[PDB]
Amino acid sequence: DRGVNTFSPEGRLFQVEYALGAIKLGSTAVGICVNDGVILASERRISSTLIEKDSVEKLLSIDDHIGCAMSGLMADARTLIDYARVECNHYKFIYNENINIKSCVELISELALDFSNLIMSRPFGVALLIGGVDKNGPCLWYTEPSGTNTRFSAASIGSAQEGAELLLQENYKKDMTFEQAEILALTVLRQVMEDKLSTSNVEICAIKKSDQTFYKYNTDDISRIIDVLPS
Amino acid sequence: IYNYNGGCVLGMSGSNCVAIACDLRLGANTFTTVSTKFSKIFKMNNNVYVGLSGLATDIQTLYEILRYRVNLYEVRQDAEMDVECFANMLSSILYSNRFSPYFVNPIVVGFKLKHYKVNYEPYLTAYDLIGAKCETRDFVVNGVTSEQLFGMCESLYVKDQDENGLFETISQCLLSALDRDCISGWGAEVLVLTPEKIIKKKLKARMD
Amino acid sequence: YSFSLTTFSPTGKLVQIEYALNRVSSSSPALGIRAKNGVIIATEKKSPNELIEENSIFKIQQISEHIGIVYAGMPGDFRVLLKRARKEAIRYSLQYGSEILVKELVKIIASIVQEFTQTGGVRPFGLSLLICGVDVYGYHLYQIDPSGCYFNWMATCVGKDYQNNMSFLEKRYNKDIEIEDAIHTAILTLKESYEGVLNEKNIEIGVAYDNKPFKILTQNEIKDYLI
Amino acid sequence: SYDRAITVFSPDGHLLQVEHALEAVKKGGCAVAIKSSNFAVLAVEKKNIPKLQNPKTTEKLIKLDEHNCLAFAGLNADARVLVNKTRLECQRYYLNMDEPAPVDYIAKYVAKVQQKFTHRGGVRPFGIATLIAGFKNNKEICIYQTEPSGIYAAWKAQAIGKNAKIVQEFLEKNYQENMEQKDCIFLALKAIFEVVELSSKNVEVALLTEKDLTFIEEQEINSMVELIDQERT
Amino acid sequence: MYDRHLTIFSPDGNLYQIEYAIKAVKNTNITSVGVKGENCAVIISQKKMATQYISQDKLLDYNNITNIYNITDEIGCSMVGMPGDCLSMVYKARSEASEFLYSNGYNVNAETLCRNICDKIQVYTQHAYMRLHACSGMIIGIDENNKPELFKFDPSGFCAGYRACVIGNKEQESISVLERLLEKRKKETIDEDIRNTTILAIEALQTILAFDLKASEIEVAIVSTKNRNFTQISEKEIDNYLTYIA
Amino acid sequence: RRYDSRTTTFSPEGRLYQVEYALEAINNASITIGLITKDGVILGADKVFISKLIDKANNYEKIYKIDKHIFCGVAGLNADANILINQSRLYAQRYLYNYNEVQPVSQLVVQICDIKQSYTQYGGLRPYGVSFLIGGYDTKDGYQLYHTDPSGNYSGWFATAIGTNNLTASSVLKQEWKNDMTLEEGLLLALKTLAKSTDTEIPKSEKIELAYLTNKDGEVYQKYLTEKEIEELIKLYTQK
Amino acid sequence: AGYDLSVSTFSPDGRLYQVEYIYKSINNNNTALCLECKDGIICCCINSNMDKNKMIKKNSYNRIYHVNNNIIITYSGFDGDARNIIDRARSEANTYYYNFHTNIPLHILVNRISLYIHAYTLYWHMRPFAASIIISSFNEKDKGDIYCIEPNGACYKYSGIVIGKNKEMFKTEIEKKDYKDINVRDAIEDIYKFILTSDDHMNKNNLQNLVNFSWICKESSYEFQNIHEEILTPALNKAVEYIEK
Amino acid sequence: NLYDTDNIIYSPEGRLYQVEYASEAIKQGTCAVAIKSKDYVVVSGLKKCISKLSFPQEKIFKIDDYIGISMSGITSDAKVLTKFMQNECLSHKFLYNENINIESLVRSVADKYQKNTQKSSKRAFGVGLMIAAYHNEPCIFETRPNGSYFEYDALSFGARSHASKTYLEKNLHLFEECSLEELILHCLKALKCSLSSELTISNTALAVVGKNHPWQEISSLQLEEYLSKVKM
DSSP states (O other), X not given: OOOTTOBOTXXXXXXXXXXXXXXXXXOOEEEEEETTEEEEEEOOOOOXXXXXXXXXXXXXXXXXXXXXXXXXXXXXXXXXXXXXXXXXXXXXXXXXXXXXXXXXXXXXXXXXXXXXXXOOOSXXXXXXXXXXXXXXXXXXXXXXXTSOOEEESEEEESTTHHHHHHHHHHHOOSSOOHHHHHHHHXXXXXXXXXXXXXXXXXEEEEEETTTOSEEEOOHHHHHHHHHTOOO | OOSTTOOEEEEEEOSSOEEEEEEOOEESSSSOEEESOOOSEEEEETTEEEEOOBOHHHHHHHHHHHHHHHHHHHHHHOSOOOHHHHHHHHHHHHHHTSSSOOOBOOEEEEEEEEEOOEEEEEEEEEOOSSOOOEEOSSOEEEETTHHHHXXXXXXXXXXXXXXXXXXXXXXXXXXXXXXXXXXXXXXXXXXXXXXXXEEEEEOOOOOO | OOOOSSOOBTTBOOHXXXXXXXXXXXXXXXEEEEETTEEEEEEEOOOOOTTOOTTTOOSOEEXXXXXXXXXXXXXXXXXXHHXXXXXXXXXXXXXXXXXXXXXXXXXXXXXXXXXXHHXXXXXXXXXXXXXXXXXXXXXXXXXXXXXXXXXXXXXXXXXXXXHHHHHHHHHSOOTTOOHHHHHHHHHHHHHHHHSSOOOBTTEEEEEEESXXXXXXXXXXXXXXXXX | OTTOXXXXXXXXXXXXXXXXHHHHHHHSOOEEEXXXXXXXXXXXXXXXXXXXXXXXXXXXXXXXXXXXXXXXXXXXXXXXXXXXXXXXXXXXXXXXXXXXXXHHHHHHHXXXXXXXXXXXXXXXXXXXXXXXXXXXXXXXXXXXXEOTTSOEEEESEEEESTTHHHHHHHHHTTOOSSOOHHHHHHHHHHHHTTSSOSOGGGEEEEEEOSSOEEEOOHHHHHHHHHXXXXXXX | OOSSSSSOOOTTSOOHHHHHHHHHHHHTOOOEEEEEOSSEEEEEEEOSOOSSSSOOXXXXXXXXXXXXXXXXXXXXXXEEEOHHHHHHHHHHHHHHHHHHHHHHSSOOOHHHHHHHHHHHHHHHHHBSSSOOOOEEEEEEEXXXXXXXXXXXXXXXXXOEEESEEEESTTHHHHHHHHHHHHHHHHOOOTTHHHHHHHHHHHHHHHHHHOSOOOGGGEEEEEEETTTOSOXXXXXXXXXXXXXXXX | OTTOOOOSOXXXXXXXXXXXXXXXXHHXXXXXXXXXXXXXXXXXXXXXXXXXXXXXXXXXOXXXXXXXXXXXXXXXXXXXXXXXXXXXXXHHHHHHHHHXXXXXXXXXXXXXXXXXXXXXXXXXXXXXXXXXXEEEOOTTTOSEXXXXXXXXXXXXXXXXXXXXXXXXXXHXXXXXXXXXXXXXXXXXXXXXXXXXXXXXXXXXXXXXXXXXXEOGGGSOEEEEOOHHHHHHHHHHHHHO | OOTTSOTTOOOTTSOOHHHHHHHHHHHXXXXXXXXXXXXXXXXXXXOOGGGSOOSBOTTOOOOXXXXXXXXXXXXXXXXXXXXXXHHHHHHHHHHHHHXXXXXXXXXXXXXXXXXXXXXXXXXXSSOOOOEEEEEEEOXXXXXXXXXXXXXXXXXXXXXXXEESTTHHHHHHHHTTSOOSSSOTTTHHHHHHHHHHHHOSSOOTTGGGTXXXXXXXETTTTSSOBOOOHHHHHXXXXXXXXXXXX | OOSOSSSSOOOSSXXXXXXXXXXHHHHTSOOEEEEEOSSEEXXXXXXXXXXXXXXXXXXXXXXXXXXXXXXXXXXXXXXXHHHHHHHHHHHHHHHHSSOOOHHHHHHHHHHHHHHHHHSSSXXXXXXXXXXXXXXXXXXXXXXXXXXXXXXESEEEOSSSHHHHHHHHHHSSTTTTTOOHHHHHHHHHHHHHHHHOOOOOTTTEEEEEEETTEEEEEOOHHHHHHHHHHHHO
16 A cells, blocks of 8 residues: 555654554563673563474574574564674674674664665564673663664563563662662563473573673573572 | 597489498597497488587587487478478577587488479588588588598489489498598498488498 | 555456456457468458558557567557567577577566466456467467467457357368468458448558568559458 | 555554565475484475376475475565575575585575565565474584574474465474484374375475485375375274 | 557447547648649648647747757758747757768658658557657758658658648648649749749638738748758748738 | 556565466466476477468477477467577586586576566566476486476476466376377377367367477487378277 | 555545645745746845744845856755755756766756756655755846746746746736746846745845845846845835835 | 655645654754854853753753754754764864864755755654854754755743743843853753753753864863852
8 A cells, every 4th residue: 555664744754653562562572780780581471382492482592792682573673683783793804892782772772763765674673681891891782663763771672561671760779789670570470471480491601791692591591590589 | 639539421413312421439548449339320200311520528418409409390291391491490400509519510411302293302412510501412521531532422322313322422432431440440330321211231340 | 565456266267367358358359361472461440530640550560670560459459569579689689699489478578478377466468459460480379468468360350249150260260271262351351340430541451471571561453452 | 566565564564575485385285394314304295197297297395405405385486586596595605604504504694684575675585484404513403494584493393385374283293313213204194194195196305414315215105195094994 | 447548449349549649730730731743842831839828928029939950951841830849840850861871871761751750750659658749840852863842740650742732730621622722733944934933822821821922921841853951932022922912 | 666566566465466377377378288207208288269361381389499318388378488598508508518418407597587586576677477397307317397487486397287277188197198108109198188178179280399308329300290191090990 | 544644645535745745845845936037037036934034134035045156046945855956956056067078958957957856756765855946047048037846846947937936926917917027127127026925924024134136137247146225225225215105 | 645755745735744753853842042142152051951860951952163063852863963074173173174164064964955855755854953163154054854054143942932032032132242151051041941841960061262262071070169159
């Protein structure tokens, strides 16, 4: 009926708004940024028991010092992640230093609007919660199909993102310790699941300030965090 | 460059009979051979034959290009192809790489059909490495051993001739020519096409 | 932006090609006869006002020394098809050094018409060529359509009232017909088709007399034939 | 048209061409895959006209590489095209890395290609669901699945095509770890015949090992269909 | 649906865009007549603006208006239709004539130029993203045999020869006028027949249009063997010819 | 955009709507027959009658040869057929150029179905409204016969019939065909199923056309039956 | 009935509505007048619609441009489409001088510009230009040569033309007398009076911060020159004094 | 009604609806305001903050020494335009070793607006830029989705711009010939009028550029001092 790049009477692009509709469904994920580092997590929406659950992974690494958490159309998300890590390694080749997270999300947003001729064919329909550490300090960032990127102390994406933002607003406080951040993330995540929290039912990653290195928590660390989790 | 894989071809005409012949050598580094079966004659149609002399890879590549074009022509037209059409198309192909050419000096030997019954007119012609066609109407020779063959044919050609005498004539001309060239020889084959039949024979040459 | 304006409808039928045949059926008729020792292409031109000269407009053309052509439809389509057919005959003669076969030319022009039916951003050609010629394999007569399909005929008619002209030509035709009798049957067929009165400058004829060049008859020769 | 977007987001936020490709998949014939220990079993159905059709010309189940194998459900022409693409990419990887292509790379590449045709103008989505079987670089058997949307995941067992939900429900309550070859073939033949008419001629089952893919003979299949027919009755 | 918006065949076999462009040419209500005799060929048109929103204002140099252009020294033309389309058509004609001289080394023939412009018009008809050029016209010249020539083309791409023709409204009614005057002529010096042809053209335009034809409001040009070049005649000489007709 | 035809675009049910209309165009066309025999492979067909003044001599409009060892029968639009015939001949001679051996028929039909699938998927061009019965011989697999369609699908067939009244023809083939059979028996069965499909008791010699391909004397060759040979075959059919 | 949706479609009456809509847009846009005189030509532009914008600087918005410093070019319509056409005129002049080492004749330049504008009214994908352009020059021998190209692609020579809003009353005042014999310097009085009369949006205060001017006459040695305020403000004061009386 | 399907179709009134919708997207954007005196152009804007956990978005951007912009509309389009202007100024200073002429840059970006409005299968940018610079004179320019640009003494973009414009034309005469401090104060009054719900150090942006004053955002302490002066 209309083209991809047709403005609405209200000045909004139809395809961009429909892409915003697509990210409203998906796996819930939560991010927290504190002085000692950054934390990301996902509800790990497991399919039937015949799936391995190792291949189905929601927390990938753009680089050694950057994590991510996806939402929406996932194949489009892997395409964006692949382009992001390629450009970050291009920075690492052209410049010795590690790329800042702001530049990475700016490049990701630049690719996301490539369908508007100003090649791709439509918006990507992906929301990312990128997190990392650099010389400026630890931070996390939000991305959406409209190209605007906003920088957060704590956020969430996916299906139950509204309640996750409400609980993060109620509970998050500045000058927080990293252990406080981990238990806060698991409390919010547990409150917004459908199924009971467990070890295989959740995945976590973090990038410490000292290490400046991506590190996905294994089953032992997750169980240790769950055992000291209030209820 | 033609000393590398030296070769020779020959073709005569007669009374309702035509002959084509070649040497079976394949050279390498001029003065050492590697095979005694490399036929320069290639059948292409029921009454058209072509003799390619020069570099072996160019001989083979030109054979597949012409076979592609020929079999396309019989399949589309659904009828047998003429010698003149093949000669003109060969001249166009050799000219199409006027710069960086195929290092091959081919010939064409066959029969010309004049329908009305039908009469088989002999046809012979020769080419440079670009397609410098020249109708000859008698003996046609091409290769490194061309001069010796030109010397032999005028002494030995007897105008129109029987197919047996044509075979003796072309065989003696080729054998006397190849004996006087060091980089050309190692056996021979003589194809004598007629409308009724074709006789293919190999000669007890100085292959050593 | 390039997309096929021509497309399959339910039950197919290629509606644009059907409209092209409707254009051909309304256009001024043409016909051709294959004889024992010759082939004819003939067509009537509309009864002209005195300002037109027939020495400028020509529905009869020659592609080569031995090959003629006549059409029924849009003139510009016929002009571009004729020019490209001349180029095809020329490139074949450049390659193989001979006058082009009728079958190869018919196949190439049929493929071009199909390409214009299939290609996006275009419409089919609104005419129906009628190629005649002589070569080694006897005489031929062919008929191109907007669909890009060719049919081998021995005698055929195109245009308005083509079914009735086909029936009349079937009534008066023999395989061993002489060339003069074929010309007379062409004149009688177009006379029955026109529903009027004919003369020189109202009809045009082309013919190939044996293994000789394709010839277009002047008005004097046609006036001799009409008597 | 040439170079324009034909798949687009609906008002509800769905790419309707991708769901239409999913219905095209769902109309296509069924296929099953199982793995255990160091081998895998691949099963696909079959449909032929008796006395006229040649069963040899069917290529529902194939081999891509020395070790990788593939099964599909949907439009067969698109499957053949993507199969040739993946074989080309297999030999391209083997010329630029000098190691045979692992199954994970090929599954990722198939998903990438299907997302590419889903996210470019002038091309509609590949109307096929594939599931690839092969050995990982560490000599570990893993079978991958792939949807037209570009989604892929690793499964211990899964099915596609007509009535895939029912077969997948059956496999959830019968799959075991580290089963014998006869046990895997038995389980696959039971699973495919839950939603397929019972006859030896309606399946083409094979077993993949590090040596090569070996298709099961007709006699063993006839014994197996007779045995499960006895078991049901 | 959309059978006639583009250059497409309608259910009856009629590309309706052709007649729409032709009637658009007619709506400009500029008449242009051509005629040939022996060793001469005269072309005439009106010195007015076409019919559209802009009207002829007082501060408009009426001399600059002209429907007769030229392609080459030996070849002239009179395009009638939309102004931009006519200007584009003469530029394309100039291009084909000049590349013909470059490639073939001798000046083009008007028949060949008419066929070439008809082929470009065919290219416009065949494709959809090409709008039709609403610009019909005449071309005149003298060929290698030293005889005159006059050709016409439409937006249909139908090039055909003539010895007398008219572009614009009332063409069917105007064919009788040209036939009548040509029959009158059929019932001569190299210069006297030029005069006869010129009075025939002006009388034909007078009879077709039916008003006085002020010489400032028209424009006349000729090629002959005396000159062989396309030279457009001055206003006073046309006034003398009109007074002779009166 | 507004004038787009929606060619390469899925249905709600996943059919594309264009190959379907192409197949209805196929089903209205003249019938073609296919048979594999121990001595050869046969592609008999039925001429559509345009006029009696059509040249009976030659003018084989349904069966065409792609090479000395490959030949096919058309069951749809003739122009879309002939362009694909030219592409097929090009692919055959290209393979012979590349590899210096004859192309197997399976490779060739894969190439035609691939190029037909391309216009079904890429671009916005209509598909080719033609379905072939490609047959031939190779040393790898011997006599084969296939059935191509506008979707780019192909499948092997020992014997099949396509076009109008293909159900009745396929029923006759299922009833009468045998695994091992002679060339004459196959030709007679081809006349029988053509007569059954055409709703005629006795087939007309002018209304049909036959061809066969045999690997006789270690050199494969095609034969195209003339009017007198078809008259003799119909005489044998009436006798039998 | 769908024939006015694309420029490439002729109406059943044989008429391109899509160009008429462009004409209607041009007629409603800010007006421009350009006429000739003895000493030279003066050409003006009346930016009436920007009376609401009070924060714009004094006389910054100038729609009058030039090529080669001897040819005025201006417009009445879309600013961007106009500026693209100006840049194309500069490009054609550049190509002419690189080829020939001579300034381009104006009568050729208008023809090339008309073909460039006409070249965009025969594609569905290209948008036709929404701008009516006036080109003019002056030299002592051949006198002024004012042309006007339109969206249709028609170039006609004028001795004076107005386009845009209020154009009928402006021309109704321009044919009030013959300006071929009136000097360039004292015609500013007439133009100021006419813009006060015809336009129903400008007053005494708007007259020195919205309206543009330039001339190419003997006083500037027949080259382009935006007019200095010491010449404008005497005639502006006398014109408003006359209108007040 | 039906003449808003594409950007290449004039309505019967003769209007491009798509370009007007892009201008509507600009008008719904966040606020901004710029002021100049005799030797200083001050720029300010309200940085969007969607949540208390969200931090303020970047509103003001820097393009080159002595040149800067402010934003209102689609942010990705602003990213593209910023990269283009930065590349243009840096390329000019590369090949010529001098600062670029500001109005030539404005014409360049307006040409980029034009070529995307004109051809089909492309969209106009949903953003307008508030360009401020000192090219031997303070200057304030404007861009619109149609190819067009105007020069201002003062300007505002989107949100409750009516209150700001009313304050600016109420006090336009005093902007010329006043010091920089009162200039910053007046800009803050205009932004506070656009608030209508309080101005803080976090949620506002401020930049200054002038003679012997390259483009530099105001620090937190100075901005807090000016905000306290506005409150008093």
